[PDB]
Design a binder for this molecule. Structure first.
Ligand code: L0K
Ligand code: L0K
Ligand code: MG
Lengths: 451, 448, 450, 458
């Protein structure tokens, strides 16, 4: 071990570690979850520290040699070379200051190897505060997870569901309302519904981006921008947009709102919770569709991970959905409980919203590729049940009367025959209606209003 | 106390009641909460039945005498004249079919008083099903609640907060982070943050309207539109837009999504939940600011309705209720099956209550709390003059090196920057007292 | 439209209103939800005011003619005769002081009609504060809801489920795991599981009562009992226990915890949330088992209120959703007390008391109008159990797993019993008698019932 | 690397991996969270497989050399020696069958290193199924977390709060109701309330154990017990209780309820949710009482744990109350996830077990760890600003009430008005208005205005 110090005194630190005294104190203060920042969060802190040093350099506030060493070290952090040098618990000081110091200290150590002396706070934290940096890194990570990862994953799941809507356009089957047999639909129409739920999910994510992409950087300790250049925020955002290509990143509309609250994470988590609600309905219908092979609905077969496969992907999707709903409740709880100039629930809110992004992204692509794409429909079976359902007797009423339509439905169900065969077996053809009229009235695909 | 004849026997119905047998059976079946539809929901059911009758008349499917009687009876319901004719529990069949039939029966009874005979099903429910009517009325009610009521109430609260942000632009005070003394801010800056939260709230509600305003009407039993005209939905929506002025009402993008799911309600509830989260921070800050007057922060004085912060308490309690309602909505939203989500009456109760609570408490908070707040200006300046200071504004006078030495000695000896500058003998040609006091001025440090 | 003169001006009060100026101001201050206190919280406020007057009379603090007038007026409130005299919104001052004052004013107005003058504060609120009364009434109402109403309702549902478990003891059917076919169970075994869920629900409600029944009365403004007799709490609780028979009512273990927090309501709501979770599983299984009549599971028929919509399972799952939401609102209020007082009490009381009422009413309806009248498709369920690929495993030691897999495939394709398939494939002989086959494919024995 | 053969083809497995083909398929099937089972779940799966092998040996179903090898391998897993051999995602098949097979495969691989051949299914999974094992291990883990870790941690916090309540028995201060000035209390009374919240928290955990400790073992695939000995569950429970000392473990009252539902986890989460609600109140009150030191309430001082800021060099922050309130938020979210999973079983199996297990065991761990840290690094070192607190109590308008019977409520109200206006003590204001004489001696004033007696401390 080695001796390091801070404004509170002296601290023993692992002789080898890139982090310094403040990080070590936080390792000792917060042994709670045993989990630290995720790859996406460390990448965002690296991007931000690089962009700050670039702007400080551009404003002649920081020596070029120091800015260059920060930019190079921060690039190594953003690329993933130093993940082991972020040991601090998620459950740390609410502003995320410990993690901010962790980035500063690691950057200084990297620079030192390369012969450059950086002061973690006077150089690596120049023009910044703990209060504006950690939420900025959080909103970069959440915006990147929304734009670069979740939206493309939902688009892949949308396309797989729309492809089934088209493939199954004429696959007529029983409708089901209240779980009870209803007038006909097609599997295609039901999948067009699932596709619309996912398309609307993408619209929900896009609608939250004008506020999710807002960054606190430049507001310093309390939102006033004291101890930063007046244009720090607009300059740093311009660097982050050019480096990431995320045009959704923007300076906060109000510098006080951006630090006193995290309402943009609450808003975004509501979009994710809505997707989790949509995915629950889609996955539940699909596993019920596959149920059997004998005693269930046996409408479709899920691909094996023939008719006896456990619906394991639907199970993963509905478990992810449960986790997103829980995470959402934790996010709203932290969101509400800010005071005055700072919301001090940022590390916990960050853990939860980034996890929700990751789970939905990963499960959506698996569901699309390994469940949706390989579903096969029991087409003739579905049509035979639709043609045999008491639900389709209604259009006979005007030809044969209510009482006889009811007797047809009862006999068809008891004898396990089609409506068409029962109407013939009861001797109703000629008297009340012709074969041509019967085939028009009982055409189940026409009844589903599909072609 | 009259008796009626249902195809499972004899049903006694109160004599002044306009509902008939199906509604009276639903009253007997669902004695669960003892609360029925709200007036917003009754109004929306009246609007939908008048619009359907109009379109069935325009298409020649319904005789103009019957259409006229349905339209007149529907206008009375939409006008609030029959809010006592809807006795069915919220906790009813999950399609809302019972309340749909309640509307059909009341219109039939209103029509019969003017000498016209209507069949509740064949005439008043023509081209509609048991499953596309109650979700349509729910979305009409929620869209009206968002556009005509909530957004203007939030704008009133925004304008009250923004007016204080301007009044108090130079009312300097101490910042607080982690509840600890921080560098100066103004009371106006804090109120500018509150105003932005409510402005972002209005943006959040606006953002959900393209989906909240989607109506299922025309989809009939399963979403296929069987037994409705092909253009029923588009024609009914046009009548509803014309009659209500709500341009946000639209036909569903997908007629299956619009009946299998209520995801539009779940989305909208998320916006309301975010507003509840914002209101909690605003209300909490305001009651803390008003706390004391000896044991608290005593920064502001709330209007009296030793003043208890009763409107901040009402706001925070409303916020709690919107959070619970939101959880119930998401639970019902997720539990659809195949062609129908059967949680509609519960989801409707919860999202329409959330709209109403937020509307009503926002206007009360704006008018009877925010507008009348008074700042304790001299107290707030004394707190600002006790905040930590920084040496940065001395750099141009004593240089980076001396400024850094001032900062170190101030921390070590637990002194202010100001006293440390004086104690180090730094007052001279490089730095007058005037210049020290101008550089460290607390309102300049708030950068207003 | 009669008129009243306040400490702050004039107030118009409805003529047939028994409330006075403080209530009317609260009506004007809080037009938020349009919903006031429930019948159970009005009753509890009457109970509490009667017992407080009894004790103030017993200690010689209150003239007995005034105490008698309060006791008579409070009894009318407790008996539900004045449910229309409580117009204040739920969303009021967070201590429930407005509703406290509403009760004091209504009692004074009832007393006035019988010739007795009571000061709402000095007489009806004697020894009490604005902060220990409303939460005491909340905990009386919630404890009475748990003990007199919800437990007996849950016991009625338990007994209905258990009676089905016994009637269907030998009704063999396919198990289902992951929604896929599995080895046999009986409908009786499944209903015995539902019954245990409800019996465990009753255990969960019983387990929260030591803390749900804790009353703050006597703690006055901050929990110290300043301006009350030292034994006010134990005296008032003893009168409430004697009058109501509710032995679960008790003084708070800690008078500060009883006012700074409402953790007993949060605890109780968790038990109600667990019951809602159990009822969701039971109601969902029942509506799935009734699905059809052609394209669903068609295991049972629900009674009308095999084409019946499952309307009571829909009522039960909707109520369960409301209980879950209410539970989230209660926890939110519970967490956000400050120092000597939690000021979310009216919101918490609304939510907890609604949850109790919905679960009570829907459990009785579910037991009586759904569970009691279910009918099983007994022969059909046995035919599917006897035709399932899941039951060929006990053939392996006779014919090997490869021929057992061939039997399973042919039984499913030809829609025949495993028994008939084994006979049709010519496997009856020295390796397998008809009697040994019938032992190996005895699906009811595979379910291992009593 | 090193190659293997499934029934569905050839699988490559890391070289130092003790898992086999089924585990490697699950790794490829569920790349969702990148997080697998925690230490406590792995331990429980080890305990369970050892107890099962012991019972199968006792009943003469499993050869003793095979049982001894499973027992030895399972003890290594339960001792935390193999925490890196469970790579499967939490978000797996909802019965937890993947993690069950992972345990069977790791045990077979440990035994093979000692020259004994075990079939992961026919030996290590003997008398068990893919559905009654993972929920049994979940309930063992949750019961152990409640009894061995959380209750002791909560007791430590209770004792720290109760010690402050006693040290501060006479530390008089103004009450606060609605955040407004109220009549006197002691800091000791407030801390006795916080102590009771934590003690009630322990009572809530104890009250759930009769159902949390119920185990599905012996139920097999659908709860019937088919393909297992009639008494397998009571025999496995007897072994677990004897080896662990966990008296709360029991065989389920109903074998169907035990597999079709996880209501015991929903119930236990409710107790943890209530503790999070109590901890929120305690931690919020403490950081408010520590607020300032110049612009806040400055009632107490929290022990300094790390530098608060670089811009404000000497500012120190209530970091432990922030950790506690963040944990509480996580426990409330976790609780919502668990209830959601608990409600959505179907027929003979609830298929939300891995997700419900992750959330319930995380809530136990966060609450245990943060409770100990709050007790040792915050509560134990709090110091009260006694003279500040007494000065405010002695200047409070709220304390004029006991003057009423001497000078009347109108004159008492004038004393309060004046004191508050002129920033004086009530005692001094009563003097500066000449009221000491006939109706009121100087010692009679000091008896009426005794702020500690007004707090009515036992
Ligand atoms: C999950 O639903 C099923 C699963 C499998 C099969 S099956 O292909 O394996 N099948 C062959 C057909 C048959 C012929 C004669 C006797 C019995 C059977 C039943 C077995 C059918 C079904 N549904 C039905 O039999 C539907 C049904 N129709 N008519 C009714 O009167 C009736 C009464 C009660 C419940 C359901 C029914
Ligand atoms: C809800 O499940 C059902 C509902 C109704 C009925 S029914 O009684 O109305 N019925 C009579 C039997 C029959 C005879 C010949 C051809 C078709 C049919 C089906 C119609 C059966 C079923 N289930 C099945 O047919 C089950 C089944 N068995 N064998 C399979 O190979 C198969 C393949 C795909 C899907 C399911 C199956
Ligand atoms: Mg003070």
């Amino acid at each position: 071990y080695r001796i390091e110090h801070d404004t509170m005194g002296e601290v023993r630190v692992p002789a080898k570690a890139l982090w310094r005294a403040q990080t070590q104190r936080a390792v000792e203060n917060f042994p709670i979850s045993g989990r630290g920042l995720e790859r996406t969060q460390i990448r965002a802190l690296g991007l931000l520290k690089g962009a700050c040093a670039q702007v400080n350099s551009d404003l002649g506030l920081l020596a070029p040699e120091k800015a260059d060493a920060i930019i190079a070290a921060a690039a190594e952090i953003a690329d993933g070379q130093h993940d082991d040098q972020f040991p601090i618990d998620v459950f740390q000081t609410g502003s995320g200051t410990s993690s901010n110091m962790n980035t500063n200290e690691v950057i200084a150590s990297i620079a030192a190897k390369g012969g450059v002396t950086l002061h973690p706070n006077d150089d690596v934290n120049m023009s910044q505060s703990s209060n504006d940096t950690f939420p900025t890194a959080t909103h970069i990570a959440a915006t990147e997870a929304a734009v670069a990862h979740l939206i493309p994953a939902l688009q892949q799941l949308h396309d797989a569901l729309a492809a089934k809507a088209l493939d199954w356009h004429t696959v007529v089957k029983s409708g089901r309302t209240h779980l009870m047999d209803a007038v006909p639909v097609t599997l295609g129409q039901e999948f067009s519904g699932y596709a619309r739920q996912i398309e609307a999910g993408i619209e929900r994510v896009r609608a939250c981006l004008p506020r999710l992409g807002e960054l606190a950087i430049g507001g310093t300790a309390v939102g006033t921008g004291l101890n930063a250049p007046d244009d720090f925020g607009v300059r740093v955002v311009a660097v982050l947009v050019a480096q990431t290509g995320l045009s959704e990143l923007r300076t906060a509309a109000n510098s006080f709102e951006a630090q006193a609250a995290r309402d943009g994470l609450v808003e975004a988590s509501g979009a994710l919770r809505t997707i989790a609600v949509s995915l629950t309905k889609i996955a539940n219908d699909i596993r019920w569709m596959g149920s059997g092979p004998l005693t269930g609905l046996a409408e479709i077969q899920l691909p094996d991970l023939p008719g006896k496969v456990n619906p394991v992907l639907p199970e993963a999707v509905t478990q992810v959905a449960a986790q997103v709903i829980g995470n959402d409740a934790a996010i709203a709880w932290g969101g509400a409980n800010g005071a005055f100039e700072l919301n001090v629930y940022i590390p916990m809110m960050a853990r939860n919203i980034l996890e929700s992004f990751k789970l939905l992204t990963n499960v959506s692509r698996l569901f699309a590729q390994r469940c949706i794409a390989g579903l096969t429909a029991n087409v003739e079976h579905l049509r035979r049940l639709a043609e045999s359902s008491p639900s389709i007797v209604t259009p006979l009423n005007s030809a044969i009367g209510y009482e006889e339509a009811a007797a047809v439905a009862k006999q068809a169900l008891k004898e396990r025959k089609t409506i068409r065969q029962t109407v013939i077996d009861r001797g109703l053809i000629g008297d009340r209606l012709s074969i041509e009229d019967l085939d028009r009235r009982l055409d189940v695909l026409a009844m589903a209003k599909a072609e």
